[PDB]
Design a protein around this ligand. Structure first.
Ligand code: 2TM
Ligand code: MG
Ligand code: ZN
Ligand code: ZN
Lengths: 49, 1344, 69, 99
DNA sequence: GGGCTAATGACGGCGAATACCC
RNA sequence: GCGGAGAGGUA
DNA sequence: GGGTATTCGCCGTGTACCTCTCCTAGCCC
């Protein structure tokens, strides 16, 4: 997604390649992804039953 | 746990194997796969190895703990704890005695040479193709004769009796049992006493050493052949049941099953008395199975079922990276550890780190439980667990309280040097990322672009003290490699500080006078003055001139507002001048440096934090950005490019006509393009650099611009001039795959757009760089691993050995100027003896004193040129080094402390740069004196001719430069035949051309004049006269020894120098008949009939980095070594043209018989009738350190290595202190070889330490008698590590099989004495905090 | 938090047995056989022992005399 | 990811490697060298035995920490014993001597 | 589903094992 | 469900 | 036979971490 960036050092919170982000980005819920895990329970046939 | 020491290794006897074993494993089955109970007598057997489940028999008759020694009557399984199933070993009784592959296939085949029979024969026997006649009675056959099938047949038919022969490993065992060790040893010694020939003497000495090892160690040779084979405890080779009725098994289970199968089938065949052929086949098969068990891979590589990968044998488990010592015994996987992504966290103090709440809770769980139980918040431990798993407010309060002073260790994946692990005090934060203090990133090489870090928790009280005292971030500000600071501000801080301190011609609040920095900030923050504007401010600086007292001087300085604002932070002791300048990267770094040297640690820490905060703040206030217009295309670029294109077009057209070759055109084009690139670069830098033409009150003026990209470049925050060029200029020339440079460069830049071709080319460049970094990284990691390995055991053990020895340290003046000054080269080394002022009896430095900054500056005030300093290599201490011989340099400032492991610090400091630099990468015609000085010639003997030249007749001639006050500024090496201008004494003006020479041509210089007379240069045999007319042109070719034709091989053409009358003019003072052997490629242009001038041209003659460092440290003969002289005296020639010309050095005093062969191609630099010194150069080329050590001695080779390595390292601009290279060199030459006799075996390679204690023992004895006299040896770090005393150290990283086999046969005993072994055994290292412990143990032995 | 131990290492210049004496003292302090000679400011016992060392009250010899007493 | 204590491996009694199973970080040989470069003997010692490989040491240390004491005994790492047993499994007798 | 039996695409370095030249 | 192969990725 | 080249074969080739599939084999009743 395309967001409004400004190139400047902002009290060393973007010191190294790190990135500063505005709470508005989380408010608009625009970098929230859905992930999906699969889990499996297997019931086999043992000789005890 | 017992308190032990001395790990002993030896051959296992069959009785010992029976001793370890609790039962025989007869059948290969393991488990019933139906009922998971194990086998009755199988790889997994309860009656042999132990009960599967704690304290309960298989059949279930006995289950109570009450029974502890009973063995159930139904199942013969004893009732004990299942843990024993991890230690109980089994055994297999082999029907046919089998050979142990390790003792056979190991490069020196010990079965082979022990029997003095080549390996080929052993192979013939083992694969059952041929026999060997063991004691074949009264016939015509010896005792180790290999016999083929039908030779055995005809022998047997002829000789029915007195013929005992057998086959296979059992035959070999028969040979081994019947051998008389001591008798053969004495016979062998007698043979050596009668035999004098090189190769046989070496093989013979090898055999006697093997025999001595057997008779001393107590191993009997027959034990190399296995009869009983032990089987590993089951839990060490598990057969785990995968979920789903399937099983997962180690490959050892497969190999053991195969061995048992072949053994049982061979047993059955023997019980059936099957024909010989089948039992022989079965014995062969059993051999393969067993040797696959022992070491799979020295045969047909028995692959596994349906997987094509070769399965892993026991030897594979030990040897190799993935297997063992490296993997599980030096590389464990700790508890109380975590990992996460690192983040900035600017607000942190230098000594702290942001740690996520949830990670902190998880790590410190048991601490939490303890504190919870102490306060009574939880009745029992399970309630504490439940309370932690709910995570109630009380839990977070307890976490805050326990975390308070508890420090954690932060580590970043490539722990290159010791600053890759540092301790911090954690501060609980939200989030899942670890927050890392910015200043320490440089130490970690950490970047916030997805780098992760691991966090360990020191548990014990001792660990806490070690982390907080020795390892904490604030205690490590100086790099252990060189003395310079590690925590220097990196990019935003330095950019902000630069912006703040730079001044501008005219701004708001120009030229107003301020009473102090405080109102400067009042003015700036209120917007009544620019952050940079020239102003007069009153400031009170403090200076500690007295004995630690601070004196305030308060005056008016002319500065900027910003510089005052910055001055607010600066601690008391520092002069104002420090901040008054532009304050870029270098300036800030040296600021921190001075703050450390003057004030000390704590003020430096606090000042660094302040620097970070102010830099970040004012960088943010600056608003520095990067727009497309911020990078200014030079206005005159297009003109420069069009001009260069016109020039290339003109040169190409003038080529197509054919007056210049292709190579000449190539060179010209490349040079003109390089010139155009430099021109455009300089124009762009002029445009961009000082472009702010802003106006003062009236007229205009010009100043260093405020272009954001320019400030980032100039400040040293990011980018160099080169990258600026690549942005705004033309991006220079490129290299094609093979290294050749494309004729047309890439004229476009990233501000503009490249096109497909230019992009593609730069793509090649980038790809090549990335591949290089990856390959280099692997090579460097190997090199540093070898380094840390070789030097691990070296520790500073003694305070002062008290030796007078030392190395003569000079400033390295390579050619043009002083690449490295004295002060850093000598800083922190103790002196070997007092150095005197330029006037005798004026001692400037007492006997050994540590040379700290003040002494070094004092030496700068005087004009001392060379200082003898104690070096680690010459240190006298036994089993380690002494503090004084080492010096001070550390992360702290003081003399080295007793106990410190200098080996590992040296190895790490020498290896980190090599890996780091690869990531970072991602003619000599005339001499030109640089500074006004006197010329001085060293090691020369000239004879002035009529033309007035100081003719150089010595190959080792040097031309140094003495300055006004007696100092050698410049130094050059002048070869034979170099035209000279000024002789000795003359004062040379600044930058005047004193010499001249042909770039691609070394002339041979005649000393006298007259006619050239041809002697033994007969026409047709070795030379072909093709001569031109009167003007004296010819093509007479005097070829060298190698290139001489087949007929003119022995006929040596010569040139006698005669005068106009005919008589050969003789060299002044000497009677020698001048017989000039024309050297290689002697083009005799000036034919007979032209009076030779002094200087006629006789013959025209037209690696670095990581591999070079690795080669120097491995001491690799560079395949074309230069040659040196052994003794002095008249050299002479000898028996001519055998295929390698003989040179016999004849000493005037010593014995003559030293002959050295020389290949034909070699040219000699010395005359026959010359006075050579020991170790002078005879041939040109790289010299192998071995020769330098042997002839010149220790200090010469160590100086050579140190300088040659330091050259490579400084070429890349990485500064390393010489002490580390010195420590490595000292570790290299740990060994000597004895030349005299008296207590040793007269030739054994033995470490110099034992030899020195042997000499001390002879001195202690009332009669010294023979003593021990020895010769030093220099070994490359791999071999040097291979010849270590401890066998665990050597097995830890090299071929495990070889060293293990050597130690097993030798019966070697390891007292551990070192670091890596002590690590492996899991006890305290003898270095640092644990040194005392080991010292205590030293007192514990041989005491009451 | 005690950010620098520079004065404690200036007391004993080896910088290694400093750790040993401080560990012995802090171990006598944690398992409550002894009492701190300095008013604690909610520090844990490690930093307490370092704070005591830097003030000159405790070293190895004081430990030996007090233990035999 | 973080762990205090959890499941350990079968043959060499070191804690599992990984994230799926709790798993500890690998204090590799380079990290060992880093600790050796300091005079950090006790940290390396605990890291080598009590933190990963020594069974009795790890359980005694858990109990000791819970009890609020931080002392510890080091003992011999189990992986070394596995090494001894494996080398002894060859025809090589390697014994831990005593005097 | 269950039971039983038994090939080719690295490279360097180094040191030992023949090939051969007297 | 400890392990080991193969594949991919991170720094 | 003894020294010198030349082939030959073994040993090594950076760390830390994170995902996925697949694991003794084959044939007949
Ligand atoms: N295959 C790899 C790739 C990287 N690394 C390591 O990860 C870091 C990346 O450096 P880097 O070059 O990516 C950034 P930096 O070094 O700080 O320079 P720059 O910011 O001016 O661009 C380095 O410490 C490497 O040692 C590794 O161990 N194996
Ligand atoms: Mg990074
Ligand atoms: Zn039973
Ligand atoms: Zn010394």
């Amino acid at each position: 997604q395309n967001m409004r960036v400004a190139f400047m050092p902002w009290n060393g919170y973007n010191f190294e390649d790190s990135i500063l982000v505005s709470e508005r980005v989380v408010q608009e819920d625009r970098f929230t992804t859905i992930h999906i895990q699969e889990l499996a329970c297997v019931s086999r046939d043992t000789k005890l039953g | 746990t017992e308190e032990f020491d001395a790990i002993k290794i030896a051959l296992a006897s069959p009785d010992m194997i029976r001793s370890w074993s609790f039962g025989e494993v007869k059948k290969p089955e393991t488990i019933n796969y139906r009922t998971f109970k194990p086998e009755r007598d199988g790889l997994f057997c309860a009656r042999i190895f132990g009960p599967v489940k704690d304290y309960e028999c298989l059949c279930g008759k006995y289950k109570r703990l009450k029974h502890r020694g009973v063995i159930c009557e139904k199942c013969g399984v004893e009732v004990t704890q299942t843990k024993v199933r991890r230690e109980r070993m089994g055994h297999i009784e082999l029907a046919s005695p089998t050979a142990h592959i390790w003792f056979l296939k190991s490069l020196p085949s010990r079965i082979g040479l022990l029997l003095d029979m080549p390996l080929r024969d052993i192979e013939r026997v083992l694969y059952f193709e041929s026999y060997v006649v063991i004691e074949g009675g009264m016939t015509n056959l010896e005792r180790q004769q290999i016999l083929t099938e039908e030779q055995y047949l005809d022998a047997l038919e002829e000789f029915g009796d007195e013929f005992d022969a057998k086959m296979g490993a059992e035959a070999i065992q028969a040979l081994l049992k019947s051998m008389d060790l001591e008798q053969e040893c004495e016979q062998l010694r007698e043979e050596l006493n009668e035999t004098n020939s090189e190769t046989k003497r070496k093989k013979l000495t090898k055999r006697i050493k093997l025999l001595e090892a057997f008779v001393q160690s107590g191993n009997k040779p027959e034990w190399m052949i296995l009869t009983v084979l032990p089987v590993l405890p089951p839990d060490l080779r598990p057969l785990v049941p995968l979920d789903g009725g399937r099983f997962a098994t180690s490959d050892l289970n497969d190999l053991y099953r195969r061995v048992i199968n072949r053994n049982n089938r061979l047993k059955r065949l023997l019980d059936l008395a099957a024909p010989d052929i089948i039992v022989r086949n079965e014995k062969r098969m059993l051999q393969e199975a067993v040797d696959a068990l022992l070491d799979n891979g020295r045969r047909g590589r028995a692959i596994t079922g349906s997987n094509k990968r070769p399965l892993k044998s026991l030897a594979d488990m030990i040897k190799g990276k993935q297997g063992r010592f490296r993997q599980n015994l030096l590389g464990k996987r700790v508890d109380y550890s975590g990992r996460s992504v690192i983040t900035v966290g600017p607000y942190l103090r230098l000594h702290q780190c942001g740690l996520p709440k949830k990670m902190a809770l998880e790590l410190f769980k048991p601490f939490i439980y303890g504190k919870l139980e102490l306060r009574g918040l939880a009745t029992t431990i399970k309630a504490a667990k439940k309370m932690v798993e709910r995570e109630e407010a009380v839990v977070w309060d307890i976490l805050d309280e326990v975390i308070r002073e508890h420090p954690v260790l932060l580590n970043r994946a490539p722990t290159l040097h010791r600053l890759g692990i540092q301790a911090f005090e954690p501060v609980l934060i939200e989030g899942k990322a670890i927050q890392l203090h910015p200043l320490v990133c440089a130490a970690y090489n950490a970047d916030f672009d997805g780098d992760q870090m691991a966090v360990h928790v020191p548990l014990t009280l001792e660990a806490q003290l070690e982390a907080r005292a020795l390892m904490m971030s604030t205690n490590n500000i100086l790099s252990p490699a060189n003395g310079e600071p590690i925590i220097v501000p990196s990019q935003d801080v330095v950019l902000g500080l630069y912006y703040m301190t730079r001044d501008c011609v005219n701004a708001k609040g120009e030229g107003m006078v301020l009473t102090g920095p405080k109102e400067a900030e009042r003015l700036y923050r209120s917007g009544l003055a620019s952050l940079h504007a020239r102003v007069k401010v009153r400031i009170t600086e403090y200076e500690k001139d007295a004995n630690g007292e601070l004196v305030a001087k308060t005056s008016l300085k002319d500065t900027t507002v910003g510089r005052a604002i910055l001055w607010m932070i600066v601690p008391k002791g520092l002069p104002y001048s420090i901040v008054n300048q532009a304050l870029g990267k270098k300036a800030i770094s040296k600021m921190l440096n001075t703050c450390y040297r003057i004030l000390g640690l704590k003020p430096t820490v606090i000042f660094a934090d302040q620097i970070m905060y102010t830099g970040f703040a004012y960088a943010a206030r600056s608003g520095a950005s990067v727009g497309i217009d911020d990078m200014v295309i030079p206005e005159k670029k297009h003109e420069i490019i069009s001009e260069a294109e016109a020039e290339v077009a003109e040169i190409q057209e003038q080529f197509q006509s054919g007056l210049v070759t292709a190579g000449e055109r190539y060179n010209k084009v490349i040079d003109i393009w390089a010139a155009a690139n430099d021109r455009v670069s300089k124009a762009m830098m002029d445009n961009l650099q000082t472009e702010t033409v802003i106006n003062r009150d009236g007229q205009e003026e010009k100043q260093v611009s405020f272009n954001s990209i320019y400030m980032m470049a100039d400040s040293g925050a990011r980018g160099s001039a080169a990258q600026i060029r690549q942005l705004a200029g033309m991006r220079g020339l490129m290299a094609k795959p093979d290294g050749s440079i494309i004729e047309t460069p890439i004229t476009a830049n990233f501000r503009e757009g490249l096109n497909v071709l230019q992009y593609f080319i730069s793509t090649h460049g980038a790809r090549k760089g990335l591949a290089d970094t990856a390959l280099k990284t692997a090579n460097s990691g190997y090199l540093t691993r070898r380094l840390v390995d070789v030097a691990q055991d070296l520790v500073v053990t003694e305070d002062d050995c008290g030796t007078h020895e030392g190395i003569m340290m000079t400033p390295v003046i390579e050619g043009g100027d002083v690449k490295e000054p004295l002060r850093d080269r000598v800083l922190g080394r103790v002196t070997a003896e007092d150095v005197l002022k330029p006037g005798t009896a004026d001692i400037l430095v007492p006997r050994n004193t540590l040379l700290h900054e003040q002494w070094c500056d004092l030496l700068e005030e005087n004009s001392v040129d060379a200082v003898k300093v104690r070096s680690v290599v010459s240190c006298d201490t036994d089993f380690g080094v002494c503090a004084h011989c080492y010096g001070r340099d550390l992360a702290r400032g003081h003399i080295i402390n007793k106990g410190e492991a200098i080996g590992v610090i040296a190895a790490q400091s020498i290896g980190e740069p090599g890996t780091q630099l690869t990531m970072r990468t991602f003619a000599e015609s005339s001499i030109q004196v640089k500074n006004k000085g006197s010329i001085k010639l060293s090691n020369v003997k000239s004879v002035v001719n009529s033309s007035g030249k100081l003719v150089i007749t010595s190959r080792n001639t040097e031309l140094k430069l003495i300055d006004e006050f007696g100092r050698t500024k410049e130094s050059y090496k002048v070869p034979y035949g170099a035209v000279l201008a000024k002789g000795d004494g003359e004062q040379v003006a600044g930058g005047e051309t004193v010499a001249n020479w042909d770039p691609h041509t070394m002339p041979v210089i005649t000393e006298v004049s007259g006619f050239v007379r041809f002697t033994d240069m007969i026409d047709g045999q070795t030379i072909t006269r093709q001569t031109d007319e009167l003007t004296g042109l010819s093509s007479l070719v005097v070829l060298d020894s190698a290139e001489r034709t087949a007929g003119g091989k022995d006929l040596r053409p010569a040139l006698k120098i005669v005068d106009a009358q005919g008589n050969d003019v003789l060299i002044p003072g000497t009677d020698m008949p001048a017989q000039y052997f024309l050297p290689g490629k002697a083009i005799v242009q000036l034919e007979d009939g032209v009076q030779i001038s002094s200087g006629d041209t006789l013959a025209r003659i037209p690696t670095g980095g990581l591999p070079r460092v690795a080669d120097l440290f491995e001491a690799r003969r560079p395949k074309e070594p230069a040659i040196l002289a052994e003794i002095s005296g008249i050299v002479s020639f000898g028996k001519e043209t055998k295929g390698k010309r003989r040179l016999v050095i004849t000493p005037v005093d010593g014995s003559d018989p030293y002959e050295e062969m020389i290949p034909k191609w070699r040219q000699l630099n010395v005359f026959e009738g010359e006075r050579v010194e020991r170790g002078d150069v005879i041939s040109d080329g790289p010299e192998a350190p071995h020769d330098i050590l042997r002839l010149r001695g220790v200090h010469a080779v160590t100086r050579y290595i140190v300088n040659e390595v330091q050259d490579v390292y400084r070429l890349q601009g990485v500064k390393i202190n010489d002490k580390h290279i010195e420590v490595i060199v000292r570790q290299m030459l740990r060994k000597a070889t004895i030349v005299n006799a008296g207590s040793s075996d007269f030739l054994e390679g033995e470490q110099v330490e034992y030899s020195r204690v042997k000499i001390a023992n002879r001195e202690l004895e009332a009669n010294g008698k023979v003593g021990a006299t020895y010769s030093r040896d220099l070994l490359g770090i791999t071999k040097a590590s291979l010849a270590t005393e401890s066998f665990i150290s050597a097995a830890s990283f090299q071929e495990t099989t070889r060293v293990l086999t050597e130690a097993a046969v030798a019966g070697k005993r390891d007292e551990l004495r070192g670091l890596k072994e002590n690590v492996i055994v899991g006890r305290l290292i003898p270095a640092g905090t644990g040194y005392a412990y080991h010292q205590d143990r030293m007192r514990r032995r041989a005491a009451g | 938090a005690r950010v620098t131990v520079q004065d404690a290492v200036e007391k004993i210049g080896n910088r290694f047995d400093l750790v040993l004496v401080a560990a012995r003292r802090a171990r006598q302090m944690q398992v409550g056989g002894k009492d701190p000679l300095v008013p604690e400011e909610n520090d844990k016992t490690t930093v307490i022992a370092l704070r005591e060392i830097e003030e000159g009250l405790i070293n190895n010899q004081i430990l030996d005399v007090r233990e035999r007493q | 990811h973080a762990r205090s204590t959890g499941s350990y491996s079968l043959v060499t009694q070191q804690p599992l490697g990984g994230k799926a199973q709790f798993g500890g970080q690998r204090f590799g040989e380079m990290e060992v060298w880093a600790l050796e470069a300091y005079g950090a003997a006790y940290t390396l010692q605990e890291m080598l035995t009590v933190k990963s490989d020594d069974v009795n040491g790890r359980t005694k240390m858990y109990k000791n920490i819970v009890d609020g004491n931080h002392q510890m005994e080091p003992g011999m790492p189990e992986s070394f014993n596995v090494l001894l047993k494996e080398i002894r499994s060859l025809g090589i007798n390697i014994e831990l001597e005593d005097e």
